[PDB]
Amino acid sequence: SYDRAITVFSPDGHLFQVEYAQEAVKKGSTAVGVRGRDIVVLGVEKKSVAKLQDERTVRKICALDDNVCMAFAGLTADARIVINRARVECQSHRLTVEDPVTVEYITRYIASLKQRYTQSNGRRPFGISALIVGFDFDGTPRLYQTDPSGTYHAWKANAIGRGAKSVREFLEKNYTDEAIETDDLTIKLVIKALLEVVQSGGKNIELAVMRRDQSLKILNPEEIEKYVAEIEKEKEENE
Amino acid sequence: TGYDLSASTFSPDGRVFQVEYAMKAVENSSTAIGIRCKDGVVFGVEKLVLSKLYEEGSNKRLFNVDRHVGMAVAGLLADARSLADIAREEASNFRSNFGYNIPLKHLADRVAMYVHAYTLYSAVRPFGCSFMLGSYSVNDGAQLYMIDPSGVSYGYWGCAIGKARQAAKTEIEKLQMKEMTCRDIVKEVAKIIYIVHDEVKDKAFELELSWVGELTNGRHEIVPKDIREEAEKYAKESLK
Amino acid sequence: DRKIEFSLPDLEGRTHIFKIHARSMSVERDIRFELLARLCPNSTGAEI
Amino acid sequence: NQYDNDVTVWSPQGRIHQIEYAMEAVKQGSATVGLKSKTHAVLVALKRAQSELAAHQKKILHVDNHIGISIAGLTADARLLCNFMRQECLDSRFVFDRPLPVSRLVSLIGSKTQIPTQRYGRRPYGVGLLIAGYDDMGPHIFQTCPSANYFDCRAMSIGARSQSARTYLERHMSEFMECNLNELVKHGLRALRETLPAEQDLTTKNVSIGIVGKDLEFTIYDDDDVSPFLEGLEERPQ
Amino acid sequence: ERGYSFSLTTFSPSGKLVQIEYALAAVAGGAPSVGIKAANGVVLATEKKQKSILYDERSVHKVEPITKHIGLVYSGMGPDYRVLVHRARKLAQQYYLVYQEPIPTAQLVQRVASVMQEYTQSGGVRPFGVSLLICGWNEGRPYLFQSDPSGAYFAWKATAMGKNYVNGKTFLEKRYNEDLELEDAIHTAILTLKESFEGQMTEDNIEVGICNEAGFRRLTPTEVKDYLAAIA
Amino acid sequence: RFSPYVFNGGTILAIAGEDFAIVASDTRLSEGFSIHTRDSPKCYKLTDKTVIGCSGFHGDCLTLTKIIEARLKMYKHSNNKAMTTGAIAAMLSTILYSRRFFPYYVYNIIGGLDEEGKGAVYSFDPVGSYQRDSFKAGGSASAMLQPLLDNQVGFKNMQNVEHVPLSLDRAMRLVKDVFISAAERDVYTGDALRICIVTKEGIREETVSLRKD
Amino acid sequence: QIHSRKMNVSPDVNYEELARCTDDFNGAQCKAVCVEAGMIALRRGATELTHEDYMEGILEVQAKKKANLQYYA
Amino acid sequence: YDRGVNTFSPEGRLFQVEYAIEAIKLGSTAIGIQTSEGVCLAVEKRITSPLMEPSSIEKIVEIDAHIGCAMSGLIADAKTLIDKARVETQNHWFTYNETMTVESVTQAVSNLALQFGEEDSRPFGVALLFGGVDEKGPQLFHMDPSGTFVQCDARAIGSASEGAQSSLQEVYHKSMTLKEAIKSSLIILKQVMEEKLNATNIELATVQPGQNFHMFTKEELEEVIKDI
16 A cells, blocks of 8 residues: 555646656667568667676567567566566467457557556556567568557557667668568668667677567577678678 | 644654644634533523624534533534534444433543544644533533643633633633522623623624523523523623 | 736747847848747747 | 645644635636525526637536535536535435435535545545525525535625625615515626626526526526526616 | 555665664663573673662563573663564464474574564664574573664674673673683673673672573572672 | 245236327235235336336335436436436346346336337336337236237237227226226235326326225 | 825725725735725726726736636636 | 645645646647537647558547547547546446437546545546537537536647637638538648648548448548648
């Protein structure tokens, strides 16, 4: 029992805490993601490994079901509560209506959970912003995003983390449908876009794709060297 | 200052100002006095007519807790109706559990503990009321009690609440009290109200009189007021 | 005695303050300032 | 100013300023006038409009077959006390199979509004209830306050510039007992017309009248059947 | 109450807990005491001064038993001591109702400090202002433990709390040794109590309880007056 | 032990006319082998266009009547209008189901005009099911009245019989004849026959006496 | 009444109407309402006063700040 | 800088609900007009990026089959009010076999418009327009976070709410028709927005007694722009 409101109105007409927690999203690592017509792709950046330690526990890309894939920003612990909550809800949806969960349904569950988590009393908001990518029945690939206010929102390409607007400005002059024609070109599109991110020496780039008929398959750290090689070869034709 | 906010913090000399503030909030109200003869208790309340403001008979501050128990409230008004609802509720449980009429000594104590309970916590404020308690019983006599906003409760032969408190009790002790019958006292209480409160402050005032005793068979009721009219006739003989 | 307050006027004080500050400079005769004031709704005369 | 924040905190002068601020919220609403004869009780209200295309905000509302109330102040505290008001009337109708007398129902309201004026974290109810109805002993006109001091009056007015509305009443309060309904009503709306600027009065869009009577259930008229009452008036002098 | 439940003890910007540090200041201004574990039993000794000649001495007690083999003294403030005594009295019984066996001395200090640590983290209360000394000869070897208002606990061969507790700390380091007897331990416990006491030391100025393997025992003022020969 | 139910009697009849509705009932309130009273009508004017009848256990009849009268007022203060005939029948079905595992013992018939000025009769059961019919008879003498109105009003089992609509005056003597025949064979059918007629102009009542045995 | 001595008052003015609507003022503020009501009549050039003149002076001394408070009643 | 959420002003109004009306001002604009033939309604989407999918941002949301809605303000706070208003119409039909009227919907909505507190939160930050056709013909209502409920003939709210209401009083009368009111609304829209009017910036919603639903698929939208 804690009967005390945290988030109230300001004299200029705004909330404090919602526009006060979005800076914590801005202090997280970057993770981008685009969609094609057959294969979606999303890649986190800024791995920053300690070069002598484990790495299978610092995973920033997980899955709620065999259709839906996750990527977020912000702080680590708040994502763990949201993810392990949403694994229950997408599985309890199948205990009800027997379809697999549509990707629009699970985003409304997260945004409504995060909204009443700001509306209530004595509760800090979350400080994360997730990317929700899935290719449902009928095979239509699409992606969404969240916000600490709790507004689910469909894009075609997204960039979050420390340096979001710069990568979004890079995709702003990159509206080509020809890059969404070939699958490996779309993967090279993200690798070129993540090269505009911080240092990106082929080692801090962890990308993962989904061919809409298969679980998430992370590319090995040899195709990352291979795709950065052909991106350097494609950049050599500037003369 | 700095210590007078809550009712749960002591001052650095040893008192509580929230109780001190609510005491003189009772002081700003009009005058209600009380007195007892050898076989009854007589109440008297001055009531102020502002300009018209009501049908006469409105919001009378002489309440009626039990068949043999009466009130005479002053101070804030809305909390006085709350204490009347507590006191009517308390006398019903004594009737239901123990099967006879409530003694006035217990009824003063049960209410004063309830008034005390709102002086300990920061969640609620102290009451801004003070009142009287009059009763009569053939096995007990006539008793008259008095409760402050702090919760101190004991007896009197006569008392006064309001603006005119000390100036109104100087002439109460001038009377005799033992040998008097209350019907003589009914026209006595009229002049103490009528002497005090010159019309410089408020031009229009009006007098109520409540009356329980041996003549009323222990039951509490108002005086026959429009009947017999010897309050105002005998009071206006104070012209010189 | 008097508590006089100074607000951001409405839409036409700005056009007039335009005609105060941009009378006194060397400009083209093709002025218009209702176009200018509708582009800055919340502004002080210092910002003008 | 630091002791003027919560309802619980007394003043060093002994005046809880939160109630004194709630009295100001009643003075912002539109004016209304209620009065009674020996055999009838009529309250007349004045409406306002938010804009020209917007409809006028209604004031009088039916509660029971003899009790109807007027309103002033907030609208949340209006409907919150209204739902409590309709509830208590049908309870004694369900239990005792009789209508409530008007006097002891209002005593339930002062008990209802008492608790949020004493405990922490609870505002008082900013509300301006004028109450009219029959018990078994005739008409009654009641008024309330956010301090919960209900008054058994004979003619009052609450809201914005009711100062001038009261002044008309005492110089005609002696006439308010023998006259019947046709001039009892138009005595009342002669009092509203001094709560106005001197260029508009009552033009069948802003006035409503509720009447409760002996052989008459509480009936509300609005802007179309008010027009028989609005004839036979003198203009304002100057 | 209402349901506020917020803890009034938070971290410093330096990274410390301020109210716990202030509660230890009230412990250090308490009455001095000492406890010595010497190879067959534990000796506890306190410093009980009546402020006037009008007080009664057989009424208020300091060496307090918990079980027939567990005793407990303190150095801090009086009224807060009697709270967690009655808590520990009851807490020793639910071990005995379940296990039908007298509770070990290490087992209380797990549980009494768990009451005391959670009580600091809880909402709307101050911490205690009492440190403890707990003794008992469970399973042959005796024990001597010391808790504190910070919730922690230790295990001392010999220690001292109260006023001049660092002066008696240097005294016990030099005077005491590895092994002694029970009778030698009482002699040096008064010797460190005479270090900081007032002038006259009688049967009412001090009060001593001991443990044996025969059980916990509190000394009467007769034998304390009898042991007062060859004082300190 | 304490059994909470008992049978009281009574017989209710309703006929949906073309532009009217006739509701009839007796006035005997009996229990066991004895008569409590001879004046106890089962008609209840809910609105100006709706009359309900309640039979069965009389203690539930007094309770269920007062629940509906409250919810009519709760509708009007919330919606600024009155309920229709079918809206009351839809509301009553949820009320009867709300005590599914401790039921009322009440047979209900609602008659009255619709929103087009035609007779509507809704029959009920003690658990909550309902339907719209042209005529129903409920109560103790319900079995002695249903097959006769099948012949007269329903025009069933007759060869070369035309289908004339039932007029108002022909329906009046049909009601007055069936309660005479019901009073001969039923012991619960009483003395006074309260007849309520709901038209588009108001509700008329009428009382006809029967045999007093 | 004291500070209305020098000024030209129209003799249809009840001070009791004024004293009932001048709520919670002091002797300085009641003087200020009388001063402001003279100049308001000087704005439109009227010589004598009215009840409206004092009521507008009360609105100035109380200093009502803003608008759009219309969601009441 | 931390005062009560439940405290009257010293002037006497309120503290926080006055700030709630200010929060409507930073939302997009919307126009709804009640005609005797039906209720038309309009809104601006305020597209930020071409990467953003346009139809995922909605403002017209159906409540019942014959009742529309329009929101401006905080988005997911309005999504709480939409879900309740859908349910409480279904409680009405599955207890009475009739449709809840357009006025009586908003009575249930505005009950918990002001019920924030500790026992038994903050006030909401969205203003709504409710159109619909019922037994009293087509209706149009307007509410606010302060619970003040009112009927309007043609109300326009949002960021440009002041200049909309001034221009709307010029062009409105009682004897309007449907398509006349539709093209008159978008003239006000292109004056108050900053981008070019196209098939993506706005959307309409028109309910009729005849055409009982609101039905505004795209490229009917381009049909009206080429006719203006």
